[PDB]
Design a binder for this molecule. Structure first.
Ligand SMILES: O=C(c1cc(-c2cc3c(cc2C(=O)N2Cc4ccccc4C[C@H]2CN2CCOCC2)OCO3)n2c1CCCC2)N(c1ccccc1)c1ccc(O)cc1
Length: 507
């Protein structure tokens, strides 16, 4: 990373040209050049370059991914003065607090809202229950009432959780990844109404984001559920649209997941002092957010001064109101298990493979099982790193401990050749893991090849620390946990579970 310059990454759906004007003004006053870039899939590319102590000085993304960045050690801790913290809404600072430390600057507050075509529907519906009768009237005119992305649970969650569902319980400065709140009567009521809409032919089950967006922007549907990142495309379609509070369900408000667009500073950047000055003194100002906002809308903003003026726009007041009625999105990589489990529950309940009550009950069991598989992966990687001097029933953990130790000892000559020939880069790390794991289980699954599965991820975690790519260990731990949840768990339970592993290997 070049010292004396500021390289900034931000997604293309944001006002990156407005941010470039703020950097241009910063360059005139400091002599420090600010280069703003908008790479494709920067949320995947940032952990790769930052693992080798490289990449942008500043990254813009939602707060939920910054938890994984902070735990990896990719983001530097920010320490704003108390006079500057009072300028941002305190809940936005909460979304960027991890292990009791602030790891990002909050910028904008993103949340889903109800977007309606005023020409097709001058008065939008205030309740979900009156939507079916509305679709019937619009169907006679060749239009549907509501289309939105049904494939991602992020968009269906406002309705599902409106009557009491929650993703993870939060306590003691951490999320409880075993206390999942999808198995409740409220969520089953929300998922039932969603399935009823599909089975009554009010929505198509395979509608995704692009299908819904194109349908609303062309006037084919009266309403949609989307965030401020889509307002720019509706503007160019000339659809006279309004943005309002999400409909209520059983008299209870829809609670969407709240996302805090946040600016993190690379922990390897040599210009952290400059990045803090640019973020606090230039961007996080009324004039700085306005420059970005006028390029592309941010929705609600964390800066109280500029949010008070933006709230005059009904679209932004609705976004803030829908955010206040929602909940902050958990900022942990375990949400991938939550999303994966909930998505299957919705897919299966809509298709009819299982009941709504069974789908959410199984999704809660699957989420709790993922936490248990993570426990096995983490406890092994901690032991392997501790052997090398590095720092990061319980019988199964000590059984696997003896199994991997024996495997490494019996094939130590082979592990020495592998480690010396291994060329590990964050760009090619995911490919090497996927290729090897495929070869391990290509001809079937047994306990011996599962022990080898753990030991391979272990040596990749140790070799990552050696090549000064320590944050890559959290990515490998995530891949091992994913493969254990989605592939090996079918074989493990069918062959006696982990209790059969301690029966063959244990004492
Ligand atoms: O390519 C591999 C690899 C390792 C094993 C493997 C798995 C086992 C096992 C055995 C072996 C095995 O075949 N080896 C063990 C081993 C261990 C460490 C490093 C290299 C090797 C290669 C050979 C060597 N032996 C020598 C004695 O005669 C039999 C073969 O017993 C029970 O489970 N298998 C493969 C590929 C698919 C077949 C099984 N890695 C790999 C990965 C990257 C680069 C090179 C090899 C790999 C995958 C997972 C691991 O935990 C370790 C290695």
């Amino acid at each position: 990373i070049e010292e004396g310059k500021l390289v900034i990454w931000i997604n293309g759906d944001k006002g990156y040209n407005g941010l470039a004007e703020v950097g241009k003004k910063f360059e005139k006053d400091t002599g420090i050049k600010v280069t703003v870039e908008h790479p494709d899939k920067l949320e995947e590319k940032f952990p790769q370059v930052a693992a080798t102590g490289d990449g942008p000085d500043i990254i813009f993304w939602a707060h939920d991914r910054f938890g994984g960045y902070a735990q990896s050690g990719l983001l530097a801790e920010i320490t704003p003065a108390a006079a500057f913290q009072d300028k941002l809404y305190p809940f936005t600072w909460d979304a960027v607090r991890y292990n009791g430390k602030l790891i990002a600057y909050p910028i904008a507050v993103e949340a889903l809202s109800l977007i309606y075509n005023k020409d097709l529907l001058p008065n939008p519906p205030k309740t979900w229950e009156e939507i079916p009768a509305l679709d019937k009237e619009l169907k006679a005119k060749g239009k549907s009432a509501l289309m939105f992305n049904l494939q991602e649970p992020y968009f269906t969650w406002p309705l599902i959780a409106a009557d009491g569902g929650y993703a993870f319980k939060y306590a003691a400065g951490k999320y409880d990844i075993k206390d999942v709140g999808v198995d409740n009567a409220g969520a089953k009521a929300g998922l039932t109404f969603l399935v009823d809409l599909i089975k009554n032919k009010h929505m198509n089950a395979d509608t995704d984001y692009s299908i819904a967006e194109a349908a609303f922007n062309k006037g084919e549907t009266a309403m949609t559920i989307n965030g401020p990142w889509a307002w720019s495309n509706i503007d160019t379609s000339a659809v006279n649209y309004g943005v309002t509070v999400l409909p209520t369900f059983k008299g209870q408000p829809s609670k969407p997941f709240v996302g805090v667009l946040s600016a993190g500073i690379n922990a390897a950047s040599p210009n952290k002092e400059l990045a803090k000055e640019f973020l606090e003194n230039y961007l996080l100002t009324d004039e700085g957010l306005e420059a970005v906002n006028k390029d592309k809308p941010l929705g609600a903003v964390a800066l109280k001064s500029y949010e008070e003026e933006l709230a005059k726009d009904p679209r932004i007041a609705a976004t803030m109101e829908n955010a206040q009625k929602g909940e902050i999105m958990p900022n942990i990589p375990q949400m991938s298990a939550f999303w994966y489990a909930v998505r299957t529950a919705v897919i299966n309940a809509a298709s009819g493979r299982q009941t709504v009550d069974e789908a959410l009950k199984d999704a809660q069991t699957a989420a709790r099982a993922a936490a248990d598989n993570r426990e096995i992966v983490m406890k092994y990687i901690h032991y392997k790193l501790s052997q090398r001097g590095y720092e990061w029933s319980e019988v199964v953990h000590l059984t696997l401990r003896q199994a991997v130790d024996d495997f490494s000892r019996r094939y130590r000559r082979d592990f020495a050749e592998m480690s010396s020939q291994l060329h590990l880069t964050p760009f090619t790390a995911r490919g090497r893991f996927a290729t090897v794991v495929e070869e391990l289980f290509r001809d079937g699954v047994n306990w011996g090849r599962i022990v080898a599965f753990f030991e391979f991820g272990g040596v990749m975690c140790v070799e990552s620390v050696n090549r000064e790519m320590s944050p890559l260990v959290d990515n490998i731990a995530l891949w091992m946990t994913e493969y254990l949840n989605r592939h090996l768990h079918t074989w493990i339970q069918d062959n006696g579970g982990w209790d059969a592993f301690v029966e063959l290997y244990g004492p």
